[PDB]
Structures are given as C-alpha cells and as structure tokens.
Design a protein around this ligand. Structure first.
Ligand SMILES: O=C(CCCC[C@@H]1SC[C@@H]2NC(=O)N[C@@H]21)NC1CCN(c2ccncc2)CC1
Ligand SMILES: O=C(CCCC[C@@H]1SC[C@@H]2NC(=O)N[C@@H]21)NC1CCN(c2ccncc2)CC1
Ligand SMILES: O=C(CCCC[C@@H]1SC[C@@H]2NC(=O)N[C@@H]21)NC1CCN(c2ccncc2)CC1
Ligand SMILES: O=C(CCCC[C@@H]1SC[C@@H]2NC(=O)N[C@@H]21)NC1CCN(c2ccncc2)CC1
Lengths: 124, 124, 124, 124
C-alpha cells in the first residue's frame, strides 16, 4: 500500500492531504485545510501498518497535524485515525480528534470530533 | 514545553510513553502498551504546538502508533490527541482513536475510543 | 422552526438499519431500532431528546438517542448513543456520530467503547 | 444482577454537574441534569436506557442517556449523549464518554461535535 497510500488526497471539505508512506511504516507530508483557522500548508507525520493482512482488510494508519505554520497558529492539533482501502477508487476512511489548548476551566470543551473520507479525485 | 514534554510518561494503565519534542514541532519516541495485543516497544511520531499561548492554556499535541514491531502486528493504529499541562505535576491529557484494519462488512466496528492521562510518575 | 413532522417517521442508515422514531411535542424522542449489524435481532427500544425550538439561521436541529441492546431475543450487554442533528429540506438527513459502550471488567475497560458515524435518510 | 437501586439517585461529576436519575424496571432512564459548565442554567430533562440484565462476570452495566440543552431558561441548540457503564461496589461509579452536537450550517458542520469523558460518583 506504499504505492497506494502515497499521493495527493482530498476530503469531502476540499482539504488537500499530500502524503508519502515510508518503507519503515512512516507517514509524512502536508495538510491544507479548506475549513477552520488554517492557512496554506501544515506539516504532518504519522504511521501506517506496513504489513497488513491479506484478507480484504484495510490498512490501519493515523497522522497528526499541529495547526502552526509561518502564517497562523490555531493552538490546536488534529489526529486522524483510519485505514486505507485500495483498488479502483481507493479511499482513506478516518475519524478525527481536534484538541485545542485550554485552561482547566475550559478543558471540558477542548476537543472536537469528526470523520473525513479521502479520495485522490481533485475537486472542482 | 520542549523541556517539559520530553521525558518518560506513564498512563493510568501502566503504559510507557517515551517522547522527545523536537525544535520544529516534531514528536518522536516509543510506546509500550500495558494492554491489548502489543509486545515490547512501538515507534511513534507526532506534532505539538511549539509556540503556545501564554495565558494558562495547555499545549496542543498528538501522536500515532501503528501496532507493528518485530514481535507482533495487531493490524491497528492508535492516535492520541490532547495537550500538555506543565508545572509541579505536569500531565498530558488525551483522548484516543484506535482503528483496526477491517473489511467493508466489518468497518462499522473498526474504531475504539478512549482517554489516557499521562504523568511522569513511575508506577509500582 | 420545529421539526416534529420532519423527524417523525421511518429512517434507514448506510448499514441498512431501521430507525423508527416519534418526535414528541415536548422534545421527546421515542421509537425502535433494528440493527443490520452486530449482535442484534429484531427491534430494540430507543429513547432520546431533540431541540424543539432550533435556530432560524439554517442550522440543523440537535438531537440524540440511546439503544440498550437487550430485547426479548438477545442481550449484547451494551448500549449505543447517537448524537447528531436533523437537517430538513428536499433530501432530509439525520447526521450522527455514535458511542457504543459494552459492559467491561477493569482489565477490559480500556477497550469497552466503539465510535462511528451513521447517516440516516427517511423512507415513505 | 440488576442495578435499579444502584443507579437510581443523585450523582455528581468532575465538573460539579448534578445528574438525578431513576432507573426503571424495564430499562428506562429518566431524570434531570444540571451542568456546571457551558451555556446551561438550572435543570434539563434527560432520558436514556440501561442493560437491565447485565453479565454476572464482574462486568459493569452498559447505559446511555441524552440531554437536549433547551429548558425554560435557556436554549443552547445542542444535545449531549453520554455512553458508558455503571460499576457497582463500595465506591460505585458511572464512567462515560460523551458526544455534544450543536445545530450547524453546512459551512460549520465539520466543527459541530465536541467529545469528552465524565466520571460520576453518587451522593447521599
Ligand atoms: O480551526 C482550527 C484549525 C483547523 C482545523 C481544521 C479541521 S481538522 C478536521 C477537519 N478536517 C479538515 O480537513 N479540516 C477540519 N482549530 C480551531 C479548533 C477550535 N478552537 C477552539 C477554541 C476554543 N476552545 C476550543 C477550541 C479554535 C481553533
Ligand atoms: O490491541 C491492539 C493494539 C494495542 C492497543 C492498546 C491500546 S492504545 C489505547 C490504550 N492506551 C494504552 O496505553 N493501551 C491501549 N489492537 C487491537 C484493537 C481491537 N482489535 C479489533 C479486532 C477486530 N475488529 C476490530 C478491532 C484487534 C487489535
Ligand atoms: O453488537 C453489538 C450490538 C449491536 C450494535 C450495532 C451498532 S450501533 C452503531 C452502528 N449503527 C447501526 O445501525 N449498527 C451499528 N454490541 C457488541 C459490540 C462489540 N462488543 C464489544 C465488547 C467489548 N469491547 C468492545 C466491543 C460487544 C457487543
Ligand atoms: O454549552 C452547551 C450546553 C452545555 C453542555 C455541557 C457539557 S455536556 C458534557 C460535559 N459534561 C457536563 O456535565 N457538562 C459538559 N452547548 C454549547 C457547546 C458549544 N457549542 C458549539 C457550537 C458549534 N460547534 C461546536 C460547539 C454551542 C453550545
């Protein structure tokens, strides 16, 4: 899935996720979000199962973005946890957690949760 | 929080999270889980807000473990999303998502969710 | 504007489960749930709540409900809660995320909760 | 063993919110919820469900409930569902994770859900 996972992906929001799957199970690349307090590209890193089952299961993976770059800092980080599914129209199916820095009076409301699905089709 | 975040942490399960905060916002290190289909250490990587607010807020961060090493492969990955809180007894407060590789008939049940709190106190 | 009639009826989700719901005048949700997935058979009681006076700005209507997976046929020692919102219009949807908690011992509690997302559409 | 009396009563959580619940003989949960956090004032109706015949192996009792954040004082256009389990014994607890969904437009829907975890303990 190295060849499969590596590429430019787009989620249902129009966000762009450019990723490289390393030989050692590493994930690196960039994330540009179409939503929220975000501007231009952000660094990401993660990990994926570099030896998945050969039974029709997807390939487990996850990656993190801390929303700081040279343009903006949203004092937050998102983690996507999901799996890659290969074939004709390959998909990456994820759920995510977005934690913002918070005070102890704020902490109960510090984490947003959602789900993103990624394909390699360039939106229009 | 570079000096603060870097260290050996332990969660409520007795798991060991050894991490280094890089200068560029990188997180690296190892994770050994006291629970589940896991054995000895796993590679992790993530990101943290390397320039947090100076207002009493925590430092947003996240990191990923793919549960494959040279001992075992659980065909799953966990992402922890949370924040670091410094001071006398520093804590890392997280929520997490654990996705396993799944078939399309299995996918509805592929993701576990929980919360881990980390301190630098060595259990007994 | 209030969505008593928009919400009340029969819905299916993407697994083929059947959600039969009545939205009461006072914010109550009642009905039955038949799951096409998991350790479930036939219909289960559900109860929930919805915002009986939503904003007029085009926002959806917040709601939630619970199924405990015990009926006269089977008992899966677990409960799901769906949290999400009703969105009216030509193709109405109920968009949800859910938490499915199983009875667990202390040793198994870390793995006691599944998380997912279901979209419901209404049928005549 | 069934926990009608174990669950029924007044509980507080770690924010200082007050959860007043009656577990009915047929699996129903009813009561009120007063939150010490957020856009909330005084008591809100809740309804939920619990496993009325849990396993006898030491596992807790699965349950869930919903609050919609409209009462006679305030309407926060949102609903929380708590999913978790009751654990009896000398220090009984209700351990939950929760999803809090707010009414959202299509532009804001990606940010419409908060996630967290509450532990409840019972008071005389
Ligand atoms: O907007 C961002 C950074 C952009 C995240 C974009 C998200 S990532 C998941 C989804 N998928 C995408 O592709 N794009 C979106 N961060 C906010 C979070 C909420 N914030 C607070 C404020 C106060 N308290 C709590 C939280 C303020 C900062
Ligand atoms: O046990 C692991 C790997 C160890 C994860 C340990 C977890 S990480 C969050 C928590 N915090 C820790 O410190 N430790 C625990 N993975 C399972 C997941 C559930 N599995 C399935 C099987 C079939 N369908 C769906 C899921 C099988 C593989
Ligand atoms: O299968 C069911 C009951 C049917 C749930 C149906 C689910 S509701 C959300 C989704 N939307 C639907 O329409 N259908 C599915 N319960 C299992 C869950 C797995 N179980 C454990 C045990 C321990 N740890 C983790 C999980 C034990 C029992
Ligand atoms: O504050 C409340 C109602 C009070 C909820 C109390 C919560 S229940 C879970 C936790 N346990 C408790 O005991 N107390 C707290 N609702 C807000 C939430 C933030 N809101 C948005 C809007 C858009 N996107 C995301 C969030 C708008 C309205």
């Amino acid at each position: 899935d190295e060849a499969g996972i590596t590429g430019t992906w787009y989620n249902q929001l129009g966000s762009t996720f450019i990723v490289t799957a390393g030989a050692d199970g590493a994930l690196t690349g960039t994330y540009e979000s179409a939503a929220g307090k975000a501007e231009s590209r952000y660094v990401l890193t993660g990990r994926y199962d570099s030896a998945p089952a050969t039974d029709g299961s997807g390939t487990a993976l996850g990656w993190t973005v801390a929303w700081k770059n040279n343009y903006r800092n949203a004092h937050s980080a998102t983690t996507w946890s999901g799996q890659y599914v290969g074939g004709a129209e390959a998909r990456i199916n994820t759920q995510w957690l977005l934690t913002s820095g918070a005070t102890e009076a704020n902490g109960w409301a510090s984490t947003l949760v959602g789900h993103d699905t990624f394909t390699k089709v360039k939106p229009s």
